[PDB]
Amino acid sequence: MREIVHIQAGQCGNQIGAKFWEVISDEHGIDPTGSYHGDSDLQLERINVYYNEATGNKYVPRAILVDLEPGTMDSVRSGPFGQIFRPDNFVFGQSGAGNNWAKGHYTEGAELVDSVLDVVRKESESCDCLQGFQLTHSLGGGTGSGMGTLLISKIREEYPDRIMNTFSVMPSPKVSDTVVEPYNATLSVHQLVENTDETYCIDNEALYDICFRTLKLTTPTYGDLNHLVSATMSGVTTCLRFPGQLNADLRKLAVNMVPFPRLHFFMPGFAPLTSQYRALTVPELTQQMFDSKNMMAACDPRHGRYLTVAAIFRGRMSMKEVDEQMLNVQNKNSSYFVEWIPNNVKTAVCDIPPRGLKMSATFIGNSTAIQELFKRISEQFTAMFRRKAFLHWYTGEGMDEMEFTEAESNMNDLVSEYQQYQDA
Amino acid sequence: MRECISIHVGQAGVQIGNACWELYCLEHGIQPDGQMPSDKTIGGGDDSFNTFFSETGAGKHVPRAVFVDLEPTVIDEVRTGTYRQLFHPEQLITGKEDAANNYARGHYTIGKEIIDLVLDRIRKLADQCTGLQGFLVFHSFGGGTGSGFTSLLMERLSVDYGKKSKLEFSIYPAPQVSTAVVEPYNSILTTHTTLEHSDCAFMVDNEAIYDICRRNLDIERPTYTNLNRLISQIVSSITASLRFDGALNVDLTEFQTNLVPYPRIHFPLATYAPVISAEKAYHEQLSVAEITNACFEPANQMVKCDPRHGKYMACCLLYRGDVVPKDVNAAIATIKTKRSIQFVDWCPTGFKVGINYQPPTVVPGGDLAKVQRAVCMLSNTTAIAEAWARLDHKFDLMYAKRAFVHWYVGEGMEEGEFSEAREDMAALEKDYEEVGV
Amino acid sequence: MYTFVVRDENSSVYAEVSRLLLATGQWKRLRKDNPRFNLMLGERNRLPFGRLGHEPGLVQLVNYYRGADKLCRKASLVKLIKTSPELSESCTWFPESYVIYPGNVWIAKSGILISSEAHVIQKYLEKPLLLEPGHRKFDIRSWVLVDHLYNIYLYREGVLRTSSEPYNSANFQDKTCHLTNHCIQKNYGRYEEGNEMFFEEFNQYLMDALNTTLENSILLQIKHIIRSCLMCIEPAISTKHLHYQSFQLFGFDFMVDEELKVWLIEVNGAPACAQKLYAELCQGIVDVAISSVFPLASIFIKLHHHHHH
Amino acid sequence: MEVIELNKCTSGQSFEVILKPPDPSLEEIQKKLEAAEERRKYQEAELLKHLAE
Ligand SMILES: Nc1nc2c(ncn2[C@@H]2O[C@H](COP(=O)(O)OP(=O)(O)OP(=O)(O)O)[C@@H](O)[C@H]2O)c(=O)[nH]1
Numbered sequence A: 001m002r003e004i005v006h007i008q009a010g011q012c013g014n015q016i017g018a019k020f021w022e023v024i025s026d027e028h029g030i031d032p033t034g035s036y037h038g039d040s041d042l043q044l045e046r047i048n049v050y051y052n053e054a055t056g057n058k059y060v061p062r063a064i065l066v067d068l069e070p071g072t073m074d075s076v077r078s079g080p081f082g083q084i085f086r087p088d089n090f091v092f093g094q095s096g097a098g099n100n101w102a103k104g105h106y107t108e109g110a111e112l113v114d115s116v117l118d119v120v121r122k123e124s125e126s127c128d129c130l131q132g133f134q135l136t137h138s139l140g141g142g143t144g145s146g147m148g149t150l151l152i153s154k155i156r157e158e159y160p161d162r163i164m165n166t167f168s169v170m171p172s173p174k175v176s177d178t179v180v181e182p183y184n185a186t187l188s189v190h191q192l193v194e195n196t197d198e199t200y201c202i203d204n205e206a207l208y209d210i211c212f213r214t215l216k217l218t219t220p221t222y223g224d225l226n227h228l229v230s231a232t233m234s235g236v237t238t239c240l241r242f243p244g245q246l247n248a249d250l251r252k253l254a255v256n257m258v259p260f261p262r263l264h265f266f267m268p269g270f271a272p273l274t275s276q277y278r279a280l281t282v283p284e285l286t287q288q289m290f291d292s293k294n295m296m297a298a299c300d301p302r303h304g305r306y307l308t309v310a311a312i313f314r315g316r317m318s319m320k321e322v323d324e325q326m327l328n329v330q331n332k333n334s335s336y337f338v339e340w341i342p343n344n345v346k347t348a349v350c351d352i353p354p355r356g357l358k359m360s361a362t363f364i365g366n367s368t369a370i371q372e373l374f375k376r377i378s379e380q381f382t383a384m385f386r387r388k389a390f391l392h393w394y395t396g397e398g399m400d401e402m403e404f405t406e407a408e409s410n411m412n413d414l415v416s417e418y419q420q421y422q423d424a
Numbered sequence B: 001m002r003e004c005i006s007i008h009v010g011q012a013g014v015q016i017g018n019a020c021w022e023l024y025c026l027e028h029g030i031q032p033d034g035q036m037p038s039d040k041t042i043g044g045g046d047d048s049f050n051t052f053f054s055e056t057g058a059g060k061h062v063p064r065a066v067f068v069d070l071e072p073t074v075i076d077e078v079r080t081g082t083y084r085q086l087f088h089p090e091q092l093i094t095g096k097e098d099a100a101n102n103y104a105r106g107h108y109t110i111g112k113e114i115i116d117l118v119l120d121r122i123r124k125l126a127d128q129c130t131g132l133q134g135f136l137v138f139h140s141f142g143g144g145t146g147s148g149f150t151s152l153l154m155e156r157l158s159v160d161y162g163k164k165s166k167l168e169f170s171i172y173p174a175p176q177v178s179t180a181v182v183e184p185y186n187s188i189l190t191t192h193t194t195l196e197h198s199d200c201a202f203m204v205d206n207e208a209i210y211d212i213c214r215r216n217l218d219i220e221r222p223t224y225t226n227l228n229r230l231i232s233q234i235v236s237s238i239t240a241s242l243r244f245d246g247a248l249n250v251d252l253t254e255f256q257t258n259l260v261p262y263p264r265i266h267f268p269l270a271t272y273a274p275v276i277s278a279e280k281a282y283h284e285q286l287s288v289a290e291i292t293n294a295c296f297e298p299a300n301q302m303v304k305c306d307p308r309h310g311k312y313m314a315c316c317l318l319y320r321g322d323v324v325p326k327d328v329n330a331a332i333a334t335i336k337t338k339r340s341i342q343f344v345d346w347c348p349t350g351f352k353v354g355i356n357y358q359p360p361t362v363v364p365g366g367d368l369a370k371v372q373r374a375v376c377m378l379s380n381t382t383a384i385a386e387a388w389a390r391l392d393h394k395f396d397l398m399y400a401k402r403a404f405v406h407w408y409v410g411e412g413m414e415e416g417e418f419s420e421a422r423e424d425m426a427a428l429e430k431d432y433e434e435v436g437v
Numbered sequence C: 001m002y003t004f005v006v007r008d009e010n011s012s013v014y015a016e017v018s019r020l021l022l023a024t025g026q027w028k029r030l031r032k033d034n035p036r037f038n039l040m041l042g043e044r045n046r047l048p049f050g051r052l053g054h055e056p057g058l059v060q061l062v063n064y065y066r067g068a069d070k071l072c073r074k075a076s077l078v079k080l081i082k083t084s085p086e087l088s089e090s091c092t093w094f095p096e097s098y099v100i101y102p103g104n105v106w107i108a109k110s111g112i113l114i115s116s117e118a119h120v121i122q123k124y125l126e127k128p129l130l131l132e133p134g135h136r137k138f139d140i141r142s143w144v145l146v147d148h149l150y151n152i153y154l155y156r157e158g159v160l161r162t163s164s165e166p167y168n169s170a171n172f173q174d175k176t177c178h179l180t181n182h183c184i185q186k187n188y189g190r191y192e193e194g195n196e197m198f199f200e201e202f203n204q205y206l207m208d209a210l211n212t213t214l215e216n217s218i219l220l221q222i223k224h225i226i227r228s229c230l231m232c233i234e235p236a237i238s239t240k241h242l243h244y245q246s247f248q249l250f251g252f253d254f255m256v257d258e259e260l261k262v263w264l265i266e267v268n269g270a271p272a273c274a275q276k277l278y279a280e281l282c283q284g285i286v287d288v289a290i291s292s293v294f295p296l297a298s299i300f301i302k303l304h305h306h307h308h309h
Numbered sequence D: 001m002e003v004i005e006l007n008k009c010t011s012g013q014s015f016e017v018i019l020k021p022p023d024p025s026l027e028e029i030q031k032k033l034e035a036a037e038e039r040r041k042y043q044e045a046e047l048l049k050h051l052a053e
């Protein structure tokens, strides 16, 4: 289990997806033409996980770029690392999806999906041992949301024994394109609950607040938010991308993080928050990574309990200090970690730090506090759905009201399920 | 002589195998290429060391070893490492995909497709043996391969080699050393399924070894290399009597007879002194009294527990170095008066002593200092049930909520196998208490 | 912030040690089943000692000594004294006791029988010391705190659990004058409040009626008995060099006979204090047994005597 | 304290010292492995049926 196939879908999917490849290609010393110009051997020992080796000692991202309009993907090709992607893996329709889940899932996306799958199969075929897939997308638009979850469903049919992973950006009125986002996210969450093993919940509310409050950026662009997303993505993929101690893969992560199959929605976080000169002491990293102000999902971890936790430290530091500090928060905040899963916090260290920082920490929590995210979207949904407002956009693409009622129920179930274990 | 096959399942098994075979090679004067200059019978023999090594016409000495892992990375470091010429490639067996810390995946799913291959490579070694005793099996309780594939091997080894003895070296899981959350489940499952198939099993709690490395080797944050090098000294002690001239514990059957009167209660507590740092400039060498006395201190045990609140069924003292019988008996006389050493009423209060005059060998550049004399006590105390209770409690906590269970069921395993395995462990805890109070 | 759990709700003593710790602002109480504690305040039966001291990063302490039940049950207390050389079968301060399973006056106990006809049969002290005015039996309760280092701390205040019925040689079946237990009595408080004479008053009686002191006539023999009993079992129960540590409050029960000779009756593993003394004793447990291991931001007498021979 | 059964050699010696006197078959394994492969392949069928819907 080494190779991963990366898929990025829609405006948001391709934007954050493009930053991920910029960030991680700099860490593995791959330039914008695909040539290695690094210094350590540790940069290339697990390069197979995300890149294929081509003729002339080039590295090509195992990346499939999907959209239902050409705009964003043309920006990616024009952009700084655009030339590194395999040109055959740009798969794109022309008419767009108009921020409509139904267009993505049932009509426009249907027309395009089989050709995405042909590239997925192509990339899969030349993998020695495929461990699974990761998708970058939002749940608030139409392509990444609707088509993205169509793909997920299809990939599960063809590769039922491989791991499905998502970086799923959740919508918020603070960072909002259209009023139908709550509908699009509720239809997608139902898909994610059934058809994925792990989902990183990036809430745009939380990214905005981090940019506003805890970084002093008065007017945040999507690029400012996507700086935070790409840094977290680098964070959570560290163990996959460098050696080593725990032979780290998607399945082992899934087995240990997910005590109940539906509850696989993780609350990622990063320390230190950037946009520095002083390096953080190991106590500070440990305080900050566990701090609400550093979480990428707008939930108070104090309103729930941790089922499982995975913390990944990056840089040259005393592991003695790390273990003491990691034991200090568990023993000083012990009510917030469930007693019925012994030793639920798992710590890992990697010697190489990310660009810019001397040391850093990535947090991955399966907290029952995530319910707040789903309740927030369930309320925004019901506000509109009780008056059947904006439904014509979907019913015009063949969907029934029944399908909305179902998704509403399936999400409120998810919320009940998280509540069961927060009091248990 | 009678040949012994060592089997190393999983990462923990394999890396501990590496450590042991490195040490054995140093002890018998066998080199990385596999030549043994001090051997005069070229091409063969029936010396005590031949129980663990076969020989070839060109003079190579070859471990009676099978390394089995469901993924290649760890055994690939044996294939490319210091002792690459030592093993025949057919002894080193790897899969493609590990068991993701899942008993069921190791036992049922990925086990089924590889069990026949491994038994075949085991048969290739059993056919080179004039009179096979049986097997030493090394594994973790926590790993999926270590828990799951081991238990299926132990099932099949009972069928194909019903006459032969099976000893375990088992690594019990510890939060302080790369534990996953599901290892308590894995530990109970494999313990249940392996219980009837194992004659004598030596548990090594990673917690105990880790603190020994902190306290006595001054190692801030012990690595697997530190832990394994130390575990292999305890292993060498225990297997010394199979590989060297002597009259205590000369075959695998004797380990069962001397240490295991009640067949289910077959987990002897190992205790080991002295453990001393090679970076320590000034060290006053410890005596026979002081190291025999160190055998009754919990801080030196392979599992932390309190023998004073339990009862002994058997006690062996295996000395390595400058020791003579009268020094041992004088130390035993002193210690009996000071400490609480209660035996069961149906067993003779006593000690079977084994002394080998060659002091312990140390790996050059290792963490352990050379010592004039050392000892490994093997005592079958009921105190070791303390470890079963801890492990059982963690299982109960998670299993009350059905936490993680779906991953096991998803590999074809029935939910009932959990509570079944836990009932055997409930019976096991009760056996210890009857015998012990 | 140190942490503790509570697993005995009946414990009058550790109820107060629980409340004193919380009201320091430096000790959080956790749930009964939370493994991540510095201090257990454990159960009486089935206390899970095998789970203690295996929590990385916590130093764990508990208010019971595993193995201390051997001194605290009646059946095994007799068996301890008959078998150990350091308190021989010719032990002068223990009433001649025997064990058979289910002046020649005896007593049976584990519902108490006193006759010559009729678990443990014990020599009944026919000629006990009698406090006047009253002509009445009493027993002395001494509180002992053994800390993690095995320092034996005797609390300076004890109590006489008195009777209030004249003692009788011919009449055994009447239990109120022979058995001096606080529960069995409730003349309940005629001579002293609640049948409780504290050490200051009892010292003065001895000075007046007997021309001696509490320290000389009785308390030296108590200190010898406590120290003889605890040093006997130290190898079996000491938590020096162990992965968790233990302390324990013990309650020693004594009888003083006519010629001022002190006799051990029972050692009590989970003792209740006396109503007045809770305040001072429970604070001393905290100072000496708990805060020594877990320091924050003398009421005892230490028992030790290395005589050379 | 009696020191019995003393045996010696050049590499060591050994003795005892007393202070006081007093399986399922190949069919059934391949069976219940295959019973778990059925439940595995049943679960995969209910998935591929649910996806066909
Ligand atoms: N003492 C020691 N323990 C180890 C070693 N490697 C792993 N462990 C322990 O074994 C448990 C994990 O099991 P492993 O043996 O690594 O797993 P595996 O058997 O390879 O199984 P999968 O990876 O699940 O296929 C944990 O308790 C680890 O601390 C080692 O080299 N020495």
Ligand SMILES: Nc1ncnc2c1ncn2[C@@H]1O[C@H](COP(=O)(O)OP(=O)(O)CP(=O)(O)O)[C@@H](O)[C@H]1O
Pocket: C095, C107, C109, C122, C123, C124, C125, C126, C137, C138, C139, C178, C179, C180, C181, C251, C253, C255, C265, C266, C267, C268
């Ligand atoms: N050998 C003896 N001689 C005189 N009196 C005796 C005696 N044995 C017992 N008693 C009396 O019987 C009473 C109760 O007996 P005992 O002290 O054995 O039980 P107990 O369990 O109630 C003490 P506690 O519960 O306070 O620890 C004592 O107060 C004592 O006066």
Ligand SMILES: COc1cc(C(=O)c2cccc(-c3ccc(C)c(O)c3)n2)cc(OC)c1OC
Pocket: A235, A236, A237, A238, A239, A240, A246, A247, A248, A249, A250, A252, A253, A256, A257, A308, A309, A310, A311, A312, A343, A344, A345, A346, A347, A348, B179, B180, B181, B182
């Ligand atoms: C995909 O990135 C990660 C992978 C892993 C693992 O592969 C892994 C292996 C063994 C055990 C665990 C684990 C994970 C979580 C918990 C709560 C646990 O008890 C064990 N994981 C691990 C990661 O985090 C350290 C990864 O994130 C980068």
Ligand SMILES: Nc1nc2c(ncn2[C@@H]2O[C@H](COP(=O)(O)OP(=O)(O)O)[C@@H](O)[C@H]2O)c(=O)[nH]1
Pocket: A009, A010, A011, A012, A013, A015, A016, A097, A098, A099, A100, A138, A139, A140, A141, A142, A143, A144, A145, A169, A170, A171, A172, A175, A176, A177, A181, A204, A207, A222, A223, A225, A226, A229
């Ligand atoms: N964090 C982040 N969110 C985005 C970005 N682009 C769009 N979004 C969010 O994604 C949703 C709109 O979906 P979008 O990806 O544009 O639609 P699609 O192209 O049809 O999938 C809204 O909630 C936006 O706030 C981005 O670059 N970063």
Ligand SMILES: [Ca+2]
Pocket: A111
């Ligand atoms: Ca069309």
Ligand SMILES: [Ca+2]
Pocket: B039, B040, B041, B042, B043, B044, B045, B046, B055
């Ligand atoms: Ca030879």
Ligand SMILES: [Mg+2]
Pocket: A011, A141, A177
């Ligand atoms: Mg848009």
Ligand SMILES: [Mg+2]
Pocket: A247, B010, B011, B071, B098, B099, B143, B145
């Ligand atoms: Mg492994």
